[PDB]
Chain length 59, copies 4
Protein backbone atom coordinates (compact mmCIF):
# COMPACT_ATOMS: atom_id res chain seq x y z
CA UNK A 1 0.00 0.00 0.00
CA UNK A 2 2.39 2.67 1.20
CA UNK A 3 5.17 1.40 -1.05
CA UNK A 4 3.22 1.96 -4.27
CA UNK A 5 2.23 5.44 -3.05
CA UNK A 6 5.90 6.17 -2.37
CA UNK A 7 6.76 5.11 -5.92
CA UNK A 8 4.12 7.44 -7.37
CA UNK A 9 5.36 10.39 -5.27
CA UNK A 10 8.93 9.73 -6.42
CA UNK A 11 7.83 9.56 -10.07
CA UNK A 12 6.03 12.89 -9.62
CA UNK A 13 9.30 14.41 -8.40
CA UNK A 14 11.11 12.99 -11.44
CA UNK A 15 8.56 14.62 -13.78
CA UNK A 16 9.06 17.98 -12.06
CA UNK A 17 12.83 17.71 -12.42
CA UNK A 18 12.57 16.71 -16.09
CA UNK A 19 10.40 19.77 -16.74
CA UNK A 20 13.12 21.88 -15.10
CA UNK A 21 15.67 20.31 -17.47
CA UNK A 22 13.48 21.16 -20.49
CA UNK A 23 13.37 24.84 -19.49
CA UNK A 24 17.15 24.96 -19.05
CA UNK A 25 17.74 23.44 -22.49
CA UNK A 26 15.36 26.09 -23.88
CA UNK A 27 17.62 28.78 -22.42
CA UNK A 28 20.68 27.04 -23.88
CA UNK A 29 19.00 27.06 -27.31
CA UNK A 30 18.48 30.81 -26.95
CA UNK A 31 22.16 31.38 -26.15
CA UNK A 32 19.77 26.16 -31.70
CA UNK A 33 16.88 24.85 -33.79
CA UNK A 34 17.86 21.25 -33.01
CA UNK A 35 18.40 22.02 -29.31
CA UNK A 36 14.93 23.57 -29.15
CA UNK A 37 13.49 20.35 -30.57
CA UNK A 38 15.21 18.41 -27.78
CA UNK A 39 13.77 20.75 -25.13
CA UNK A 40 10.22 20.38 -26.48
CA UNK A 41 10.56 16.59 -26.54
CA UNK A 42 11.87 16.58 -22.97
CA UNK A 43 8.83 18.61 -21.90
CA UNK A 44 6.53 15.98 -23.45
CA UNK A 45 8.40 13.23 -21.56
CA UNK A 46 7.86 15.13 -18.28
CA UNK A 47 4.13 15.38 -19.05
CA UNK A 48 3.93 11.63 -19.75
CA UNK A 49 5.89 10.71 -16.62
CA UNK A 50 3.44 12.72 -14.52
CA UNK A 51 0.58 10.77 -16.13
CA UNK A 52 2.35 7.54 -15.14
CA UNK A 53 2.65 8.71 -11.52
CA UNK A 54 -1.10 9.33 -11.33
CA UNK A 55 -1.95 5.95 -12.85
CA UNK A 56 0.30 4.23 -10.31
CA UNK A 57 -1.62 6.14 -7.63
CA UNK A 58 -4.87 4.69 -8.99
CA UNK A 59 -3.35 1.20 -8.78
CA UNK B 1 -7.73 -1.80 -15.86
CA UNK B 2 -7.77 1.80 -17.04
CA UNK B 3 -4.65 2.63 -15.03
CA UNK B 4 -2.45 0.11 -16.85
CA UNK B 5 -3.82 1.34 -20.19
CA UNK B 6 -2.95 4.90 -19.15
CA UNK B 7 0.60 3.79 -18.36
CA UNK B 8 0.98 2.17 -21.80
CA UNK B 9 -0.33 5.29 -23.57
CA UNK B 10 2.12 7.46 -21.61
CA UNK B 11 5.01 5.13 -22.47
CA UNK B 12 4.02 5.35 -26.15
CA UNK B 13 4.27 9.15 -25.90
CA UNK B 14 7.72 8.84 -24.31
CA UNK B 15 8.92 6.64 -27.20
CA UNK B 16 7.68 9.21 -29.73
CA UNK B 17 9.51 12.01 -27.91
CA UNK B 18 12.72 9.97 -27.68
CA UNK B 19 12.58 9.37 -31.43
CA UNK B 20 12.25 13.14 -31.89
CA UNK B 21 15.37 13.61 -29.74
CA UNK B 22 17.30 11.10 -31.88
CA UNK B 23 16.49 13.05 -35.07
CA UNK B 24 17.60 16.33 -33.47
CA UNK B 25 20.92 14.84 -32.37
CA UNK B 26 21.36 13.60 -35.96
CA UNK B 27 21.04 17.19 -37.16
CA UNK B 28 23.52 18.33 -34.51
CA UNK B 29 25.99 15.70 -35.76
CA UNK B 30 25.61 17.12 -39.27
CA UNK B 31 26.37 20.66 -38.07
CA UNK B 32 30.29 14.29 -35.27
CA UNK B 33 30.99 10.57 -35.66
CA UNK B 34 30.52 10.02 -31.92
CA UNK B 35 27.38 12.18 -31.83
CA UNK B 36 25.91 10.14 -34.68
CA UNK B 37 26.51 6.98 -32.65
CA UNK B 38 24.55 8.53 -29.77
CA UNK B 39 21.65 9.42 -32.08
CA UNK B 40 21.45 5.88 -33.48
CA UNK B 41 21.49 4.40 -29.97
CA UNK B 42 18.74 6.79 -28.87
CA UNK B 43 16.63 5.65 -31.83
CA UNK B 44 17.02 2.02 -30.72
CA UNK B 45 15.92 2.99 -27.19
CA UNK B 46 12.78 4.63 -28.62
CA UNK B 47 12.01 1.44 -30.57
CA UNK B 48 12.42 -0.69 -27.43
CA UNK B 49 10.29 1.65 -25.30
CA UNK B 50 7.48 1.36 -27.84
CA UNK B 51 7.73 -2.44 -27.57
CA UNK B 52 7.40 -2.10 -23.79
CA UNK B 53 4.25 0.01 -24.17
CA UNK B 54 2.60 -2.67 -26.31
CA UNK B 55 3.52 -5.46 -23.90
CA UNK B 56 2.02 -3.47 -21.01
CA UNK B 57 -1.12 -3.16 -23.15
CA UNK B 58 -1.24 -6.95 -23.46
CA UNK B 59 -0.97 -7.23 -19.67
CA UNK C 1 11.38 -12.98 -4.07
CA UNK C 2 15.02 -12.73 -5.09
CA UNK C 3 14.12 -11.19 -8.45
CA UNK C 4 12.41 -8.15 -6.92
CA UNK C 5 15.36 -7.70 -4.54
CA UNK C 6 17.71 -7.82 -7.53
CA UNK C 7 15.66 -5.11 -9.24
CA UNK C 8 15.86 -2.86 -6.16
CA UNK C 9 19.65 -3.34 -5.89
CA UNK C 10 20.04 -2.47 -9.58
CA UNK C 11 17.89 0.65 -9.17
CA UNK C 12 20.06 1.69 -6.21
CA UNK C 13 23.12 1.43 -8.47
CA UNK C 14 21.38 3.57 -11.10
CA UNK C 15 20.67 6.28 -8.51
CA UNK C 16 24.33 6.30 -7.45
CA UNK C 17 25.46 6.66 -11.07
CA UNK C 18 22.96 9.46 -11.74
CA UNK C 19 24.30 11.34 -8.71
CA UNK C 20 27.79 10.95 -10.18
CA UNK C 21 26.51 12.45 -13.45
CA UNK C 22 25.03 15.43 -11.57
CA UNK C 23 28.39 16.21 -9.94
CA UNK C 24 30.18 16.03 -13.30
CA UNK C 25 27.71 18.42 -14.92
CA UNK C 26 28.30 20.77 -11.95
CA UNK C 27 32.00 20.79 -12.81
CA UNK C 28 31.19 21.43 -16.47
CA UNK C 29 29.05 24.41 -15.43
CA UNK C 30 32.03 25.78 -13.50
CA UNK C 31 34.31 25.48 -16.54
CA UNK C 32 26.74 27.95 -17.12
CA UNK C 33 23.62 29.08 -15.27
CA UNK C 34 21.44 26.80 -17.39
CA UNK C 35 23.87 23.88 -17.05
CA UNK C 36 23.81 24.30 -13.27
CA UNK C 37 20.02 24.03 -13.36
CA UNK C 38 20.34 20.74 -15.25
CA UNK C 39 22.81 19.38 -12.67
CA UNK C 40 20.51 20.27 -9.75
CA UNK C 41 17.55 18.62 -11.48
CA UNK C 42 19.60 15.49 -12.17
CA UNK C 43 20.50 15.33 -8.46
CA UNK C 44 16.79 15.42 -7.56
CA UNK C 45 16.13 12.57 -10.02
CA UNK C 46 18.86 10.49 -8.34
CA UNK C 47 17.25 11.13 -4.94
CA UNK C 48 13.83 10.05 -6.25
CA UNK C 49 15.22 6.92 -7.93
CA UNK C 50 16.78 5.87 -4.63
CA UNK C 51 13.36 6.29 -2.97
CA UNK C 52 11.89 4.02 -5.65
CA UNK C 53 14.51 1.35 -4.95
CA UNK C 54 13.60 1.30 -1.26
CA UNK C 55 9.87 1.08 -1.96
CA UNK C 56 10.47 -1.87 -4.29
CA UNK C 57 12.41 -3.46 -1.43
CA UNK C 58 9.36 -3.05 0.81
CA UNK C 59 7.23 -4.76 -1.85
CA UNK D 1 3.66 -14.77 -19.94
CA UNK D 2 4.86 -13.61 -23.33
CA UNK D 3 4.30 -9.96 -22.43
CA UNK D 4 6.74 -10.01 -19.50
CA UNK D 5 9.31 -11.80 -21.68
CA UNK D 6 8.85 -9.09 -24.32
CA UNK D 7 9.50 -6.43 -21.68
CA UNK D 8 12.73 -8.14 -20.58
CA UNK D 9 13.96 -8.43 -24.19
CA UNK D 10 13.23 -4.74 -24.77
CA UNK D 11 15.07 -3.77 -21.58
CA UNK D 12 18.06 -5.84 -22.74
CA UNK D 13 18.09 -3.83 -25.98
CA UNK D 14 18.00 -0.59 -23.97
CA UNK D 15 21.03 -1.69 -21.93
CA UNK D 16 22.96 -2.47 -25.12
CA UNK D 17 22.14 0.96 -26.56
CA UNK D 18 23.11 2.72 -23.32
CA UNK D 19 26.47 0.94 -23.40
CA UNK D 20 26.92 2.21 -26.96
CA UNK D 21 26.21 5.75 -25.71
CA UNK D 22 28.84 5.37 -22.97
CA UNK D 23 31.51 4.42 -25.52
CA UNK D 24 30.63 7.40 -27.72
CA UNK D 25 30.89 9.82 -24.80
CA UNK D 26 34.30 8.27 -24.03
CA UNK D 27 35.42 9.20 -27.55
CA UNK D 28 34.03 12.71 -27.10
CA UNK D 29 36.05 13.06 -23.88
CA UNK D 30 39.17 12.09 -25.82
CA UNK D 31 38.52 14.75 -28.46
CA UNK D 32 37.25 16.07 -20.69
CA UNK D 33 37.73 14.81 -17.14
CA UNK D 34 34.10 15.57 -16.30
CA UNK D 35 32.85 14.04 -19.56
CA UNK D 36 34.80 10.87 -18.80
CA UNK D 37 33.03 10.67 -15.43
CA UNK D 38 29.69 10.86 -17.23
CA UNK D 39 30.68 8.05 -19.62
CA UNK D 40 31.74 5.77 -16.76
CA UNK D 41 28.48 6.43 -14.91
CA UNK D 42 26.47 5.70 -18.06
CA UNK D 43 28.30 2.37 -18.40
CA UNK D 44 27.28 1.46 -14.83
CA UNK D 45 23.65 2.32 -15.65
CA UNK D 46 23.78 -0.01 -18.68
CA UNK D 47 25.13 -2.80 -16.46
CA UNK D 48 22.32 -2.27 -13.93
CA UNK D 49 19.62 -2.14 -16.61
CA UNK D 50 20.81 -5.49 -17.95
CA UNK D 51 20.51 -6.91 -14.41
CA UNK D 52 16.93 -5.63 -14.30
CA UNK D 53 16.11 -7.35 -17.60
CA UNK D 54 17.31 -10.70 -16.24
CA UNK D 55 15.34 -10.33 -13.01
CA UNK D 56 12.19 -9.57 -15.00
CA UNK D 57 12.91 -12.76 -16.95
CA UNK D 58 12.99 -14.69 -13.67
CA UNK D 59 9.61 -13.19 -12.75
Amino acid sequence: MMAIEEIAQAIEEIAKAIKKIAWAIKKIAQQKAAIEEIAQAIEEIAKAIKKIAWAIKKI
